[PDB]
Ligand binder design. Structure first.
Ligand SMILES: [Cl-]
Ligand SMILES: [Cl-]
Ligand SMILES: [Cl-]
Ligand SMILES: [Cl-]
Ligand SMILES: [Cl-]
Ligand SMILES: [Cl-]
Ligand SMILES: [Cl-]
Ligand SMILES: [Cl-]
Ligand SMILES: [Cl-]
Ligand SMILES: [Cl-]
Ligand SMILES: [Cl-]
Ligand SMILES: [Cl-]
Ligand SMILES: [Cl-]
Ligand SMILES: [Cl-]
Ligand code: NA
Ligand code: NA
Ligand code: NA
Ligand code: NA
Ligand code: NA
Ligand code: NA
Ligand code: NA
Ligand code: NA
Length: 129
């Protein structure tokens, strides 16, 4: 599923991401834009052989099991495929664990490089929330 910008903002807010660990909703929407272009089915392979899955490109190195990432962990206790669902529950629940692990949203390189310090409010501008 490819979410609309405000559609995704609403879904994230409902799932408790607005101001989760202090990160306003616009941060999450911005992260999602640059990670996946709002596409739940997005996948990308990392240089180390791990793979990123879903709207927030959660990595199989630590967070989900895909059966093909040697020496990796599955800290969200989910098959990586669950992160590709049209229902973003699994992605959000896992993102909550990731963002709580010490480095906040810096875990998402694209957030650090493209959203951090920017006017992220613009990402939820005009949305009925
Ligand atoms: Cl779609
Ligand atoms: Cl957009
Ligand atoms: Cl809502
Ligand atoms: Cl915001
Ligand atoms: Cl992989
Ligand atoms: Cl994801
Ligand atoms: Cl990696
Ligand atoms: Cl594995
Ligand atoms: Cl594990
Ligand atoms: Cl599994
Ligand atoms: Cl959803
Ligand atoms: Cl933080
Ligand atoms: Cl990570
Ligand atoms: Cl900011
Ligand atoms: Na899009
Ligand atoms: Na497996
Ligand atoms: Na799926
Ligand atoms: Na999803
Ligand atoms: Na889900
Ligand atoms: Na950018
Ligand atoms: Na930017
Ligand atoms: Na920010």
């Amino acid at each position: 599923k490819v979410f609309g910008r405000c559609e995704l903002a609403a879904a994230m807010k409902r799932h408790g991401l607005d101001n989760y660990r202090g990160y306003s909703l616009g941060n999450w929407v911005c992260a999602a834009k640059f990670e996946s272009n709002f596409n739940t089915q997005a996948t990308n392979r990392n240089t180390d052989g791990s793979t990123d899955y879903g709207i927030l490109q959660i990595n199989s190195r630590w967070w989900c099991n895909d059966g093909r990432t040697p020496g990796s962990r599955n800290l969200c206790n989910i098959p990586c495929s669950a992160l590709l669902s049209s229902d973003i529950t699994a992605s959000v629940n896992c993102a909550k664990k990731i963002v709580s692990d010490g480095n906040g949203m810096n875990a998402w390189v694209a957030w650090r490089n493209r959203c951090k310090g920017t006017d992220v409010q613009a990402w939820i501008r005009g949305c009925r929330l």
